[PDB]
Amino acid sequence: RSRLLEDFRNQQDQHGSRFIQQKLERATAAEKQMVFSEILAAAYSLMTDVFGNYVIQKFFEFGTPEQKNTLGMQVKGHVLQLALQMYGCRVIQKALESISPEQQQEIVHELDGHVLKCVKDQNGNHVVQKCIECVDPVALQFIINAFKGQVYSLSTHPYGCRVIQRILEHCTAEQTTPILDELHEHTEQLIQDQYGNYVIQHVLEHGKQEDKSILINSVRGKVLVLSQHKFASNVVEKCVTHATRGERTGLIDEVCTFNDNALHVMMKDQYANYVVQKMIDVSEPTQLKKLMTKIRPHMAALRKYTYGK
Amino acid sequence: SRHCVFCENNNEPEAVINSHSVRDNFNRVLCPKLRTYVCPICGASGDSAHTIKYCPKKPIITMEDAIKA
RNA sequence: UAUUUGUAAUU
Ligand SMILES: [Zn+2]
Ligand SMILES: [Zn+2]
């Protein structure tokens, strides 16, 4: 048959897989069941294929769901092995949106307590996020219960912060609440971290108002210190935008009382000027005019930089 | 592009702006005006040159340092 | 004259 491989190379291979993709929309269902029945044998090895996985992905939709289930069973028993594998996990995450929610729940029950070494993989985190988006949050209570004591240590993790945002965006109140309090504990250190600022930033533009009130109250006193910091400056940015008029006024009045030269540190420093800019376009004309008449002289120190204000 | 920005912000003639790019292909500083400038804080120059506002040792200033000065 | 404006894991 390899003689026909070199008789078609003269005109699992990218040509054959992508032509399968562009002609799977045609042909007969008898050929569909033909190939599917020709794969059901040992698909456990066909998952970890660089371009067989394109084919598996493409067929997880155009076929009758019977093939989705019958091939679904030819996977369980080896999920902890195929979840870390690159192409296997592309197959998985591209397959969790086509099967039935029951088989989905079977997959969720396949891995419990493993979360530790799962998101701590280059491939496990993507699948975890895909499941937090797909699977019902109530079935993922093992995630919320696998993080007791593990919230602060993994919220600063690069693969961890993504999963944290996915949990906070696709869950109920009972699931988002305990992790949210775990975040309210270590806030002052999370902001300083390169990935805690993604988490807090995601909170300020998604969560309930009350969390934003708590966090804003846990900042009043660190405006110049964090606007001068590298990552925290974004927290200040996306913090002054999403706020009530009363909190905007509170922080604005907390800034305009800076010791003059502190305003010079604001305008000069490589980060605080963003805080100034995004602070301009949220305030009411009352506090806006009370800030125009406050740092107007320092303006005469930005015409040499790149600020056309 | 093939042009720098540092020389553009300092209003150098239009040929100097388009003469060099801001940095190297290896994040080495390339603009000769910036490579000349020795950092008054961290002392570095040339490949790792930078101005004061962007110095890695530019200290974080609290409200206390704003009261005492 | 010190002047460039600033963050995220895979086919
Ligand atoms: Zn230059
Ligand atoms: Zn320096």
Side-chain angles (χ1 to χ4, degrees):
Chain A
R1 295 170 182 171
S2 42
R3 272 196 170 186
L4 200 57
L5 154 72
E6 301 302 319
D7 265 336
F8 184 78
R9 197 170 185 89
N10 284 333
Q11 303 172 357
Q12 306 182 28
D13 207 83
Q14 193 164 4
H15 287 275
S17 295
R18 298 299 273 264
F19 187 79
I20 285 169
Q21 172 175 346
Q22 284 198 351
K23 275 296 183 179
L24 245 181
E25 311 172 355
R26 306 293 188 270
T28 323
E31 301 187 32
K32 301 178 185 177
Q33 184 58 33
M34 171 188 67
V35 182
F36 159 75
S37 193
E38 283 185 342
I39 298 175
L40 194 69
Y44 163 72
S45 186
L46 291 176
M47 305 324 187
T48 66
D49 286 340
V50 56
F51 283 97
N53 81 93
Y54 285 70
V55 194
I56 307 163
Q57 292 181 6
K58 189 63 176 182
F59 195 77
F60 258 109
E61 304 137 359
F62 287 84
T64 170
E66 172 191 5
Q67 302 160 311
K68 308 175 193 172
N69 290 273
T70 317
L71 245 192
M73 296 186 305
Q74 256 288 336
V75 177
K76 191 181 180 184
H78 287 96
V79 182
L80 194 66
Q81 192 83 9
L82 297 183
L84 307 188
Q85 234 293 337
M86 169 57 180
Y87 322 113
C89 89
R90 278 253 182 247
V91 164
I92 295 168
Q93 76 166 10
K94 207 68 176 182
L96 300 154
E97 53 186 354
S98 297
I99 66 171
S100 57
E102 290 88 327
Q103 204 173 208
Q104 229 171 339
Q105 269 276 36
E106 195 172 359
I107 307 172
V108 177
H109 302 336
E110 176 69 7
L111 290 189
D112 188 358
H114 277 95
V115 196
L116 286 179
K117 280 288 185 59
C118 294
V119 193
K120 288 179 191 174
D121 177 52
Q122 187 178 343
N123 304 329
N125 51 91
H126 302 282
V127 196
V128 166
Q129 304 175 223
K130 206 54 175 296
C131 301
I132 306 166
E133 294 175 340
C134 291
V135 192
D136 180 53
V138 192
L140 307 183
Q141 188 64 21
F142 76 108
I143 300 181
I144 313 298
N145 300 137
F147 287 162
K148 271 188 176 179
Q150 298 277 3
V151 175
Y152 169 58
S153 181
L154 299 173
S155 300
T156 71
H157 190 270
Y159 303 154
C161 67
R162 290 279 181 167
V163 171
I164 288 289
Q165 301 176 13
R166 304 307 181 272
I167 287 289
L168 264 181
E169 70 194 33
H170 278 142
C171 268
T172 71
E174 167 140 2
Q175 298 152 335
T176 51
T177 293
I179 314 300
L180 186 61
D181 282 316
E182 294 276 3
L183 295 182
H184 275 4
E185 189 94 18
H186 299 102
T187 292
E188 312 150 3
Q189 313 143 13
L190 286 172
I191 313 173
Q192 192 193 4
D193 182 81
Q194 48 172 343
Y195 294 103
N197 68 82
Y198 286 137
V199 177
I200 305 283
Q201 258 189 84
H202 177 90
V203 174
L204 307 185
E205 55 205 14
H206 293 95
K208 199 49 187 175
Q209 178 60 33
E210 299 165 345
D211 320 318
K212 312 174 191 192
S213 300
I214 292 181
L215 293 175
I216 284 182
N217 197 82
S218 178
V219 164
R220 290 196 171 96
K222 304 174 291 182
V223 184
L224 178 67
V225 196
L226 296 182
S227 298
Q228 216 182 4
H229 192 256
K230 180 187 175 184
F231 313 109
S233 60
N234 279 91
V235 170
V236 192
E237 263 192 51
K238 296 305 172 181
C239 162
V240 305
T241 42
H242 293 86
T244 182
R245 34 149 206 84
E247 285 160 346
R248 282 203 296 250
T249 304
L251 296 172
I252 276 181
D253 285 36
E254 189 193 336
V255 177
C256 76
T257 59
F258 284 175
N259 190 254
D260 274 326
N261 79 335
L263 316 172
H264 260 130
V265 177
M266 286 286 303
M267 315 311 302
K268 180 184 184 66
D269 188 75
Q270 43 176 331
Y271 309 132
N273 61 83
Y274 288 104
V275 172
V276 178
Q277 281 206 22
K278 265 196 180 292
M279 259 193 192
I280 299 169
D281 309 85
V282 284
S283 56
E284 295 187 8
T286 60
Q287 52 200 18
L288 168 72
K289 193 174 183 180
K290 258 210 172 184
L291 295 183
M292 275 264 283
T293 59
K294 194 52 180 56
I295 325 190
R296 178 175 297 271
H298 301 61
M299 248 305 301
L302 302 182
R303 303 196 69 98
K304 49 190 172 184
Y305 301 158
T306 332
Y307 308 146
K309 307 307 171 185
Chain B
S1 67
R2 296 180 170 185
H3 77 91
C4 153
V5 189
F6 199 45
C7 285
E8 184 164 23
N9 193 86
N10 306 15
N11 312 322
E12 295 285 357
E14 306 182 21
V16 182
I17 302 168
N18 287 273
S19 74
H20 51 262
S21 47
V22 203
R23 327 197 85 205
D24 207 335
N25 299 129
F26 320 88
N27 274 333
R28 286 193 307 180
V29 179
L30 179 59
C31 170
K33 285 77 188 178
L34 188 51
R35 295 177 54 82
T36 293
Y37 182 39
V38 202
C39 191
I41 301 179
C42 80
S45 160
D47 302 340
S48 41
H50 46 261
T51 78
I52 300 171
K53 178 198 303 192
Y54 312 106
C55 178
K57 297 307 177 181
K58 165 66 183 297
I60 313 172
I61 304 170
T62 45
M63 290 298 302
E64 317 147 18
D65 309 326
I67 283 187
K68 234 179 184 181

